[PDB]
Amino acid sequence: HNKQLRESINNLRRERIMFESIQSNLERELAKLKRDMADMIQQANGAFEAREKAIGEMNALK
Amino acid sequence: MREIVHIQGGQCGNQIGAKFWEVVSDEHGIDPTGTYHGDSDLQLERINVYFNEATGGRYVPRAILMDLEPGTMDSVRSGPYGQIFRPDNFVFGQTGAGNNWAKGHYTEGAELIDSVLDVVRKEAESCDCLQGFQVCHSLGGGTGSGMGTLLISKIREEYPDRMMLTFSVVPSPKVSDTVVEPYNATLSVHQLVENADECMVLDNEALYDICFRTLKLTTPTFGDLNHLISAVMSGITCCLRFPGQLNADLRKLAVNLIPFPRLHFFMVGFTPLTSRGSQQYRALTVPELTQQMWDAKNMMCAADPRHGRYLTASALFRGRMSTKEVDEQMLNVQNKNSSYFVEWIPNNVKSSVCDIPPKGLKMSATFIGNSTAIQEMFKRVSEQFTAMFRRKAFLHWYTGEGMDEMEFTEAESNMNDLVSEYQQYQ
Amino acid sequence: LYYLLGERTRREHLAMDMKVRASQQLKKDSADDLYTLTAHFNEMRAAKEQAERELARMKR
Amino acid sequence: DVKRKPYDLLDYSRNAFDTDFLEFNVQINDLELQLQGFVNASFEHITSTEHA
Amino acid sequence: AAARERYARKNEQNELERAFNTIDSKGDKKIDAEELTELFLRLGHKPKRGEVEDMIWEVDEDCDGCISLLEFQTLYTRCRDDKTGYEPRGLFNVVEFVMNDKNNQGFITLEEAMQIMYLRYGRAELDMQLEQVFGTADLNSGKILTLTEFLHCLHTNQVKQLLNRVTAKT
Amino acid sequence: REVISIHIGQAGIQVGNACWELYCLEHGIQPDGQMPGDDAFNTFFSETGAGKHVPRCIFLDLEPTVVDEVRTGTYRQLFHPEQLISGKEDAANNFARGHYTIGKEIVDLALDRIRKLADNCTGLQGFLVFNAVGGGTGSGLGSLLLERLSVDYGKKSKLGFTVYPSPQVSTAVVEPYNSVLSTHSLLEHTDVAVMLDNEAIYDICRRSLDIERPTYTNLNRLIAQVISSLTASLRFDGALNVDITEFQTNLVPYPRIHFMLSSYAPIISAEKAYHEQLSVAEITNAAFEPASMMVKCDPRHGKYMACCLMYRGDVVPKDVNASVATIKTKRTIQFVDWCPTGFKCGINYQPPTVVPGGDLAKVQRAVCMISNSTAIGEIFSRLDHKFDLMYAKRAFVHWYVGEGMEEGEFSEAREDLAALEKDFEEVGAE
Amino acid sequence: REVISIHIGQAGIQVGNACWELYCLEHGDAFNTFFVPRCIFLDLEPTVVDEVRTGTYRQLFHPEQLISGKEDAANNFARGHYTIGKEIVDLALDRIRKLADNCTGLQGFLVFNAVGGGTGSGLGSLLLERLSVDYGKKSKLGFTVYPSPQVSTAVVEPYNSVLSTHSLLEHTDVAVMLDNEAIYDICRRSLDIERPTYTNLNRLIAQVISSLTASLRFDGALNVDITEFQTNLVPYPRIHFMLSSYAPIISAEKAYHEQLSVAEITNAAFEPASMMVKCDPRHGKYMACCLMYRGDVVPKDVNASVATIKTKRTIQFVDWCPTGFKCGINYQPPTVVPGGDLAKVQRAVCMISNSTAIGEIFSRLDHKFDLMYAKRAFVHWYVGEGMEEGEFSEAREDLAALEKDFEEVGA
Ligand SMILES: Nc1nc2c(ncn2[C@@H]2O[C@H](COP(=O)(O)OP(=O)(O)OP(=O)(O)O)[C@@H](O)[C@H]2O)c(=O)[nH]1
Ligand SMILES: Nc1nc2c(ncn2[C@@H]2O[C@H](COP(=O)(O)OP(=O)(O)OP(=O)(O)O)[C@@H](O)[C@H]2O)c(=O)[nH]1
Ligand SMILES: Nc1nc2c(ncn2[C@@H]2O[C@H](COP(=O)(O)OP(=O)(O)O)[C@@H](O)[C@H]2O)c(=O)[nH]1
């Protein structure tokens, strides 16, 4: 009976390995996605900043 | 499914069980040769609780006979339904105890109970999921008291998480067969308080008065008393063998009926019990069943509950009945006689219904009441024990065999604290 | 002792599973955010293509 | 509380003060960490560089 | 009661790091079952046929096989705050003994420091784990500490409430 | 629009043997499972293979006998064998044995059967559980199963139709303990929980159904009618429909007040049916008198928070709305002040059918009322008296403590129910 | 399009007694791939072979095809490899040659053996060696029975299993593991036969074999021949040991109530409670899966089911293989055998995957083999039969290399 209990415990610990492994992959993927989030925000912001400049010069020239 | 092995000790235990297996086999339709002849499927589906199919429709009872004299064992195989028991289950000494509890507990026990335990162990592992054990014995004899007592102690050490019943007749001053009855009773009960799960107190006085007034018999031989006791024992286990509207196993009743762990001695009754002159003049209703059930004279113990209060009570009904009548009858019998029931527990009566009556009757009942009046019996034997012990009468077969003086003093002390704690909880 | 070690290990493994499930929710909704936000970037991109187009028209 | 206890300190005939001393040693370190918090706690806003 | 524990951890951390390195015999970070027997021999105690395998089995719970310094701090902290956890403590005891050792034969009065840190307890409670008396000292070794701790944990574990329960009287 | 129904314990699956008989008879499905559009049956039965219908239900119990009669009964074919779960030994009116001793190994199998039932569904509305809190199987693993359901789904509705132990009519002894320890989880795990007393159903069938000797069969029969009446809105189209996520919002004014008094109308016998016509006006009256409620308690001592009204049959919204107006302007019943409108009505077209051998007459139209009030607070106090009455000397606690419990949960659960008493009382106060 | 099947040992030809019963019943031009049958039963004990000769299929099998020796191998790999195999193996392969000569488009050979015995291990390995020399390029499908950890009928079966697998690496191209304890558990759990014999086991093994060769016998929406398993499931030349599973293994009572569709049976084929090998695929990481579909199945839902599997997280995939599936659909529904314990089904699925859970089995076997070998127990029997002390240790180190290979690839 002790041996039976031992095997059940070993199983839960082994099941933990793959879960924690896939969790590490998910953090990496979410990190890659969120870094891209910051980079794309900056690019969109640059276009907007450029836009107000172009509109101001057009109005001023007139 | 759930299985109960049967253990019969001594002469009283052996003869009680013989009528028990006859009545049970008639309920399931097995002829004395041990073959199946029933009609309904409800009889074949629940014979694994008490029997094992051997080979070709051979159903053998799951029972163990155990004693110290050959006369009882021979008297079993002589009578009908005597050929159904497996001969290996006749664990059996030869010398005898002689109504000496020490000889049944120290001298002869040491060489038999090991053999008894082998057969009992085989019958426990022969089944899958034990419900409990069932022991029928006396408290005044030697080979029933001492032999069965040590067996109970050893069994509880082996299988502790399992139920256990002990159907025990106790001695009383008016029906006094042996002379050393108090020495046997107080020591035997001293073991039952710490070993048995729950015990059912029986005595011969009540059996005699049931056959006098209710049954109105002229020559009540022991066959009729054993016939009465068998009907009660079949009633306590009908829930395991037949489906019903409200099932109640052994564990369900014990956990519900026993409010404190040492207070597990019960008073029993049975209904209906009617004479042949009045079996025609009666009706069969739940209230008619209830009053004859709760009657003081109809208790199968000679301890009047109306001298005290009820702690808990249980009812096991059998037959096609309406559960509303069951519940309203328990409520009414508790409301009119309100003083006879304990106060700090509301609804002191648990009830259950099973849809299969005993063969030959339309509707029956079985009462299991845990009252506080039982302390009378403990005092009634305790004073007789102290009266004898304060001059050491009949002591040399006790002290010369292995008991000392402190064992009897331990017995009195445990006796006295139990009657004192009954007095507190009442 | 072993019967209770097993319960603590089971608790730890479930605490990880409910965590794994929550991690998938984060993965999914963040992907949705990229689709909506890149649409926003295209709209601003469209705005400036039209914007520098009409500037040159005014210059000529 | 240490310097009101009945036993003579120089005597090893009692040998029960070895629990009083090891109870003393925890509120001395408690006093230490309290003073460490005191230094950390009275400098949260200072009027001048020079006074503080 | 927190101050005793926090202050104890503040000082024992440096002792623990060297205790780890010293238990290792291969100059690495991994503690093999092989090393444990060598340590017991240094203490002067002998393992049983399967003791070491149980010792390695119970501690490690994030991977299988040899142990690592990360597992070792996890064990240390969990066991230390374990008190009402009914948790394993097979390899905690050997390390706590080594850390609480500075004499290289065992320790005498320092049990009380161990005890007070775990709980103020009582002089009678001390008469439980061992037989040390306030005035007398003793000689001690690895043999007499691990066995007594292990037995005490088995003794507490056994007691539970079935029909041992006791209710106020009527 | 699929909902699965789970039955826990003896009383639980007995109620189910009435409901599924009634359900198959409504949709013309033979007891062997085959029919000799029409998707109304889908909410309870999945069409397997060709011309075969399997219910969306599991029976489970710790005792073998009550489940076994169903296996060999008339409906051997209707239910897939795996659904009918059984144990090896009963909990025996012991909450601890059902929550710590035997539940712990039966409920894991239960949930991985529940898993694929939910997976087979597509637009799962919710769950509905059937248990009596007096026993052990219904209480212990009942509360346990609810806890595990809350961590599995949480957001999905869990309709719990529970039977409380009646004050006077009772079969067990330790059912006070069972009810308190079970309620402690019935609070924060069930979304919507309906009480069903036993004395109420007994007293109804003695007066209205004029059956002087009623058994459990008739009780289970009328419970099926109530359940059928609030699922008719999923099964058949109506003039004004209400779904299962409407009770969530309209009947629970506070996250710890979800205990509803059920009542049905018209409970009328076969012969009186001829003599009295049953229009909408008189039946809307009959849905509020305490002589036709499913819990023996007096709502006159309390004030209503919100009510829901299922109407079945040929009912137009005109006269039912007029009748609801008439009820609110009367003063023999009263509403809580801050809630001006206390009703939610609903009408569905199909009339309730009759089962052969049943005692319900064939009626033009029927009403099922589900209200919420403060008379529920009286039941909890009445229960507290006799729970504490026995607990003050530690009676029967030795079984539960030996089975794995301690003193903490008795004291802490008792005081938690006491806090619940204060919650009902404070809301009532203006 | 023809494939011939040889059956070795008491276990191999009993499995064959189920396989050919199913084949002839199924075919009552499509039969050309199997039909006289294209088989040779061969064994060293004549008792089981003469059961075939006096059975009901006395006329079906050509008399010479039934090969039978004169004396047993005594459960000794050495005896069945060097002493008695040397006389029977030459007659066996001299028959396989002209059976292959009668064929024209031979896909490959498929062999049935149990590695715990003497014949199945010894001359089974010997026969595979000489076939690799003679043909080489033709696929050899090896359906072996490895010994279970806790259920065992022999004592020295570790010796035979290690000594057989050592050659099973470089001889068979496709190798399918089937334990007995796992199938016992399957027949107890899903088929609810509480008392199963070898007959039930051999019946559902034949169902698996027939499902993976049905692509040749009958045209499907997406056919998959014997060369596809060779390519799509073996990422490296030394990893070829495949878990097998089949669904739905359902009794008559349960099947009619259940609604069998592709998504749920694709799920059922991936739980460890329905595999033919007692191993925990959760303990491992999948490399590549192959899904055989028979019956009424359209390509949509098989693709939908495979999508749900890849997104679930109780089962993880290897990083070197993002597209780890090879599906196959065939029109013909699975046939039934009167007396068989399986009910008729509209559609069935046979999964043949590859993982690292098998790497766990070989370590578990190595320990038991290692324990007995160190004190030279039972070694003297094999040495007397013609072997020596060297080859036990060298076979041990070969399994050690395989353990390292699984731990490294899974990384
Ligand atoms: N309404 C109704 N209630 C029932 C029925 N059968 C039993 N009960 C109730 O069930 C309560 C006791 O619990 P049971 O269902 O009988 O048994 P249990 O809940 O399974 O607990 P165990 O006996 O330990 O298995 C009693 O108070 C009865 O009122 C029934 O058919 N209909
Ligand atoms: N599946 C299945 N396995 C079998 C059968 N018969 C034997 N086995 C397995 O075969 C192994 C034992 O080796 P055997 O096949 O009996 O040995 P053999 O092939 O007869 O070789 P020898 O006995 O030495 O002549 C064990 O794993 C048995 O479980 C069978 O009919 N079906
Ligand atoms: N009911 C019943 N009681 C009996 C019978 N025979 C003896 N007794 C009781 O047994 C007691 C004496 O016990 P005894 O038979 O000597 O027990 P044993 O020697 O241990 O088997 C007396 O009080 C009798 O009342 C019997 O046939 N039926």
Tab-separated table of N, CA and C in Angstrom, chain G residues 136-228:
chain	number	residue	atom	x	y	z
G	136	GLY	N	15.667	-6.131	-47.686
G	136	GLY	CA	16.199	-4.869	-47.212
G	136	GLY	C	15.261	-3.694	-47.406
G	137	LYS	N	14.961	-3.365	-48.664
G	137	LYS	CA	14.192	-2.163	-48.964
G	137	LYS	C	12.709	-2.306	-48.647
G	138	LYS	N	12.210	-3.526	-48.490
G	138	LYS	CA	10.790	-3.743	-48.254
G	138	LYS	C	10.451	-3.614	-46.777
G	139	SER	N	9.343	-2.935	-46.502
G	139	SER	CA	8.955	-2.633	-45.133
G	139	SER	C	8.576	-3.895	-44.372
G	140	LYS	N	8.975	-3.950	-43.104
G	140	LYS	CA	8.674	-5.068	-42.217
G	140	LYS	C	7.964	-4.519	-40.986
G	141	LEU	N	6.678	-4.830	-40.852
G	141	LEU	CA	5.844	-4.292	-39.782
G	141	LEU	C	5.879	-5.245	-38.594
G	142	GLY	N	6.546	-4.835	-37.519
G	142	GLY	CA	6.695	-5.690	-36.358
G	142	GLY	C	5.750	-5.364	-35.221
G	143	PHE	N	4.765	-6.227	-34.990
G	143	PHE	CA	3.802	-6.061	-33.901
G	143	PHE	C	4.205	-6.989	-32.761
G	144	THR	N	4.959	-6.455	-31.807
G	144	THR	CA	5.517	-7.255	-30.728
G	144	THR	C	4.687	-7.126	-29.459
G	145	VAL	N	4.863	-8.100	-28.572
G	145	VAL	CA	4.218	-8.122	-27.264
G	145	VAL	C	5.307	-8.029	-26.202
G	146	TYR	N	5.531	-6.832	-25.650
G	146	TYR	CA	6.534	-6.799	-24.599
G	146	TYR	C	5.931	-7.250	-23.272
G	147	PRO	N	6.753	-7.765	-22.359
G	147	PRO	CA	6.221	-8.182	-21.062
G	147	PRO	C	5.851	-6.987	-20.202
G	148	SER	N	4.726	-7.123	-19.505
G	148	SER	CA	4.225	-6.087	-18.617
G	148	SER	C	5.037	-6.015	-17.324
G	149	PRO	N	5.003	-4.868	-16.640
G	149	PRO	CA	5.741	-4.762	-15.370
G	149	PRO	C	5.236	-5.691	-14.277
G	150	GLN	N	3.938	-5.652	-13.967
G	150	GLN	CA	3.407	-6.389	-12.829
G	150	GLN	C	2.727	-7.698	-13.196
G	151	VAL	N	2.168	-7.819	-14.392
G	151	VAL	CA	1.547	-9.059	-14.837
G	151	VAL	C	2.579	-9.835	-15.634
G	152	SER	N	2.841	-11.068	-15.218
G	152	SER	CA	3.883	-11.862	-15.844
G	152	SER	C	3.503	-13.326	-15.737
G	153	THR	N	3.848	-14.093	-16.767
G	153	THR	CA	3.654	-15.530	-16.744
G	153	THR	C	4.957	-16.303	-16.646
G	154	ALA	N	6.075	-15.694	-17.009
G	154	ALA	CA	7.383	-16.320	-16.976
G	154	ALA	C	8.233	-15.687	-15.878
G	155	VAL	N	9.498	-16.097	-15.820
G	155	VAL	CA	10.462	-15.572	-14.865
G	155	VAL	C	11.637	-14.908	-15.568
G	156	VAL	N	12.164	-15.545	-16.611
G	156	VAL	CA	13.355	-15.077	-17.304
G	156	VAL	C	12.990	-14.173	-18.473
G	157	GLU	N	11.730	-13.742	-18.551
G	157	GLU	CA	11.340	-12.927	-19.698
G	157	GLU	C	12.103	-11.605	-19.804
G	158	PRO	N	12.646	-11.020	-18.722
G	158	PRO	CA	13.543	-9.873	-18.937
G	158	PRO	C	14.720	-10.206	-19.834
G	159	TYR	N	15.364	-11.353	-19.614
G	159	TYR	CA	16.481	-11.762	-20.459
G	159	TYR	C	16.077	-11.799	-21.923
G	160	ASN	N	14.927	-12.405	-22.219
G	160	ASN	CA	14.518	-12.533	-23.610
G	160	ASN	C	14.135	-11.185	-24.206
G	161	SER	N	13.466	-10.331	-23.426
G	161	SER	CA	13.009	-9.052	-23.958
G	161	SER	C	14.183	-8.155	-24.335
G	162	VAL	N	15.166	-8.024	-23.441
G	162	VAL	CA	16.360	-7.246	-23.767
G	162	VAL	C	17.083	-7.857	-24.963
G	163	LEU	N	17.317	-9.171	-24.918
G	163	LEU	CA	18.054	-9.839	-25.986
G	163	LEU	C	17.312	-9.827	-27.313
G	164	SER	N	15.991	-9.654	-27.297
G	164	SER	CA	15.254	-9.558	-28.547
G	164	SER	C	15.230	-8.137	-29.078
G	165	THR	N	15.070	-7.158	-28.191
G	165	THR	CA	14.978	-5.776	-28.633
G	165	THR	C	16.286	-5.316	-29.259
G	166	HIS	N	17.414	-5.851	-28.784
G	166	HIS	CA	18.717	-5.469	-29.319
G	166	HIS	C	18.783	-5.658	-30.829
G	167	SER	N	18.191	-6.731	-31.338
G	167	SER	CA	18.115	-6.918	-32.777
G	167	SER	C	16.904	-6.225	-33.381
G	168	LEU	N	15.831	-6.073	-32.605
G	168	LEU	CA	14.630	-5.397	-33.082
G	168	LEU	C	14.870	-3.935	-33.446
G	169	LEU	N	15.950	-3.316	-32.963
G	169	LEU	CA	16.247	-1.945	-33.375
G	169	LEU	C	16.559	-1.855	-34.863
G	170	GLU	N	17.549	-2.611	-35.326
G	170	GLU	CA	18.082	-2.416	-36.664
G	170	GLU	C	17.511	-3.371	-37.700
G	171	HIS	N	16.452	-4.110	-37.377
G	171	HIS	CA	15.869	-5.038	-38.336
G	171	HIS	C	14.465	-4.629	-38.763
G	172	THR	N	13.540	-4.453	-37.827
G	172	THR	CA	12.223	-3.994	-38.221
G	172	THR	C	12.279	-2.498	-38.494
G	173	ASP	N	11.430	-2.048	-39.410
G	173	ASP	CA	11.334	-0.634	-39.736
G	173	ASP	C	10.230	0.066	-38.970
G	174	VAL	N	9.153	-0.651	-38.678
G	174	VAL	CA	8.013	-0.145	-37.932
G	174	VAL	C	7.713	-1.160	-36.843
G	175	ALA	N	7.654	-0.700	-35.596
G	175	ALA	CA	7.518	-1.592	-34.452
G	175	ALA	C	6.448	-1.046	-33.525
G	176	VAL	N	5.448	-1.871	-33.237
G	176	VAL	CA	4.274	-1.472	-32.477
G	176	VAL	C	4.282	-2.276	-31.187
G	177	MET	N	4.226	-1.583	-30.056
G	177	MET	CA	4.261	-2.227	-28.752
G	177	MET	C	2.847	-2.566	-28.299
G	178	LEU	N	2.678	-3.771	-27.758
G	178	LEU	CA	1.396	-4.215	-27.221
G	178	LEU	C	1.663	-5.033	-25.967
G	179	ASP	N	1.315	-4.509	-24.801
G	179	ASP	CA	1.459	-5.322	-23.607
G	179	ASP	C	0.181	-6.127	-23.397
G	180	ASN	N	0.209	-7.027	-22.418
G	180	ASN	CA	-0.970	-7.824	-22.112
G	180	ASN	C	-1.750	-7.243	-20.950
G	181	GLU	N	-1.041	-6.699	-19.961
G	181	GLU	CA	-1.696	-6.117	-18.799
G	181	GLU	C	-2.547	-4.917	-19.192
G	182	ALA	N	-2.054	-4.091	-20.118
G	182	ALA	CA	-2.827	-2.943	-20.584
G	182	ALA	C	-4.114	-3.367	-21.275
G	183	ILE	N	-4.052	-4.400	-22.118
G	183	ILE	CA	-5.248	-4.853	-22.822
G	183	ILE	C	-6.214	-5.527	-21.861
G	184	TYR	N	-5.691	-6.251	-20.873
G	184	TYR	CA	-6.547	-6.757	-19.808
G	184	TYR	C	-7.337	-5.619	-19.178
G	185	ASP	N	-6.655	-4.518	-18.854
G	185	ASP	CA	-7.333	-3.375	-18.255
G	185	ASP	C	-8.338	-2.753	-19.217
G	186	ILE	N	-8.054	-2.786	-20.521
G	186	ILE	CA	-8.982	-2.224	-21.498
G	186	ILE	C	-10.255	-3.055	-21.551
G	187	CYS	N	-10.106	-4.377	-21.628
G	187	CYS	CA	-11.268	-5.250	-21.712
G	187	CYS	C	-12.081	-5.224	-20.428
G	188	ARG	N	-11.440	-4.934	-19.297
G	188	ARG	CA	-12.172	-4.800	-18.044
G	188	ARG	C	-12.910	-3.473	-17.945
G	189	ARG	N	-12.296	-2.390	-18.416
G	189	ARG	CA	-12.872	-1.065	-18.218
G	189	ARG	C	-13.947	-0.748	-19.254
G	190	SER	N	-13.603	-0.831	-20.537
G	190	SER	CA	-14.522	-0.410	-21.587
G	190	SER	C	-15.424	-1.538	-22.078
G	191	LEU	N	-14.862	-2.719	-22.329
G	191	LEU	CA	-15.661	-3.848	-22.790
G	191	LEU	C	-16.364	-4.600	-21.670
G	192	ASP	N	-16.105	-4.246	-20.415
G	192	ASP	CA	-16.694	-4.893	-19.240
G	192	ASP	C	-16.791	-6.412	-19.375
G	193	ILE	N	-15.683	-7.042	-19.754
G	193	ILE	CA	-15.490	-8.475	-19.541
G	193	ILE	C	-14.611	-8.645	-18.311
G	194	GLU	N	-15.207	-9.135	-17.223
G	194	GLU	CA	-14.465	-9.273	-15.976
G	194	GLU	C	-13.487	-10.442	-16.019
G	195	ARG	N	-13.756	-11.448	-16.854
G	195	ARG	CA	-12.911	-12.633	-16.982
G	195	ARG	C	-12.494	-12.811	-18.438
G	196	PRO	N	-11.477	-12.085	-18.897
G	196	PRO	CA	-11.018	-12.248	-20.276
G	196	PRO	C	-9.931	-13.301	-20.419
G	197	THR	N	-9.898	-13.908	-21.599
G	197	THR	CA	-8.894	-14.882	-21.996
G	197	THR	C	-8.044	-14.313	-23.128
G	198	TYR	N	-7.148	-15.141	-23.668
G	198	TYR	CA	-6.342	-14.690	-24.797
G	198	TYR	C	-7.187	-14.460	-26.040
G	199	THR	N	-8.328	-15.142	-26.159
G	199	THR	CA	-9.118	-15.039	-27.382
G	199	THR	C	-9.626	-13.620	-27.593
G	200	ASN	N	-10.142	-12.990	-26.533
G	200	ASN	CA	-10.634	-11.621	-26.645
G	200	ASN	C	-9.518	-10.655	-27.015
G	201	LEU	N	-8.353	-10.803	-26.384
G	201	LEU	CA	-7.189	-9.990	-26.721
G	201	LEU	C	-6.852	-10.096	-28.203
G	202	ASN	N	-6.667	-11.324	-28.687
G	202	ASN	CA	-6.309	-11.541	-30.084
G	202	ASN	C	-7.378	-11.034	-31.043
G	203	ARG	N	-8.638	-10.993	-30.611
G	203	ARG	CA	-9.694	-10.503	-31.491
G	203	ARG	C	-9.551	-9.011	-31.763
G	204	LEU	N	-9.325	-8.208	-30.722
G	204	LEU	CA	-9.204	-6.767	-30.916
G	204	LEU	C	-7.835	-6.340	-31.432
G	205	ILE	N	-6.815	-7.187	-31.308
G	205	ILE	CA	-5.565	-6.938	-32.021
G	205	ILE	C	-5.778	-7.041	-33.525
G	206	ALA	N	-6.529	-8.052	-33.965
G	206	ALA	CA	-6.863	-8.173	-35.381
G	206	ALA	C	-7.642	-6.965	-35.884
G	207	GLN	N	-8.508	-6.394	-35.043
G	207	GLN	CA	-9.241	-5.199	-35.451
G	207	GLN	C	-8.291	-4.045	-35.734
G	208	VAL	N	-7.228	-3.919	-34.942
G	208	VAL	CA	-6.267	-2.842	-35.152
G	208	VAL	C	-5.514	-3.057	-36.458
G	209	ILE	N	-5.036	-4.283	-36.680
G	209	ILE	CA	-4.279	-4.603	-37.888
G	209	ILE	C	-5.114	-4.337	-39.131
G	210	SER	N	-6.354	-4.827	-39.136
G	210	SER	CA	-7.239	-4.621	-40.276
G	210	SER	C	-7.515	-3.148	-40.539
G	211	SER	N	-7.553	-2.323	-39.492
G	211	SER	CA	-7.836	-0.906	-39.689
G	211	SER	C	-6.694	-0.167	-40.376
G	212	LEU	N	-5.448	-0.572	-40.154
G	212	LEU	CA	-4.339	0.129	-40.789
G	212	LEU	C	-3.976	-0.426	-42.160
G	213	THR	N	-4.527	-1.571	-42.551
G	213	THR	CA	-4.350	-2.090	-43.899
G	213	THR	C	-5.579	-1.898	-44.781
G	214	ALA	N	-6.682	-1.394	-44.224
G	214	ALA	CA	-7.895	-1.162	-45.001
G	214	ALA	C	-7.709	-0.110	-46.084
G	215	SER	N	-6.701	0.754	-45.957
G	215	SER	CA	-6.422	1.731	-47.004
G	215	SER	C	-5.981	1.061	-48.297
G	216	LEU	N	-5.321	-0.093	-48.204
G	216	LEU	CA	-4.955	-0.834	-49.404
G	216	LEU	C	-6.140	-1.602	-49.975
G	217	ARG	N	-6.928	-2.246	-49.117
G	217	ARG	CA	-7.978	-3.132	-49.603
G	217	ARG	C	-9.140	-2.364	-50.220
G	218	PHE	N	-9.402	-1.142	-49.758
G	218	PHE	CA	-10.585	-0.407	-50.183
G	218	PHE	C	-10.239	1.057	-50.394
G	219	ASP	N	-10.862	1.668	-51.397
G	219	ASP	CA	-10.579	3.060	-51.716
G	219	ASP	C	-11.228	3.996	-50.703
G	220	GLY	N	-10.475	5.012	-50.274
G	220	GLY	CA	-10.965	5.990	-49.332
G	220	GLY	C	-10.842	7.407	-49.873
G	221	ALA	N	-11.424	8.347	-49.124
G	221	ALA	CA	-11.321	9.756	-49.482
G	221	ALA	C	-9.887	10.254	-49.413
G	222	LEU	N	-9.080	9.678	-48.526
G	222	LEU	CA	-7.679	10.067	-48.377
G	222	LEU	C	-6.916	8.802	-47.981
G	223	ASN	N	-6.345	8.134	-48.977
G	223	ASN	CA	-5.695	6.858	-48.739
G	223	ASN	C	-4.269	7.048	-48.248
G	224	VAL	N	-3.808	6.073	-47.471
G	224	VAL	CA	-2.512	6.119	-46.807
G	224	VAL	C	-1.935	4.705	-46.789
G	225	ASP	N	-0.850	4.494	-47.526
G	225	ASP	CA	-0.343	3.154	-47.773
G	225	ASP	C	0.661	2.777	-46.685
G	226	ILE	N	1.394	1.682	-46.895
G	226	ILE	CA	2.297	1.193	-45.860
G	226	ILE	C	3.595	1.991	-45.811
G	227	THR	N	3.933	2.716	-46.877
G	227	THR	CA	5.149	3.519	-46.888
G	227	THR	C	4.978	4.839	-46.146
G	228	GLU	N	3.744	5.222	-45.821
G	228	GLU	CA	3.496	6.518	-45.201
G	228	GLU	C	3.861	6.510	-43.722
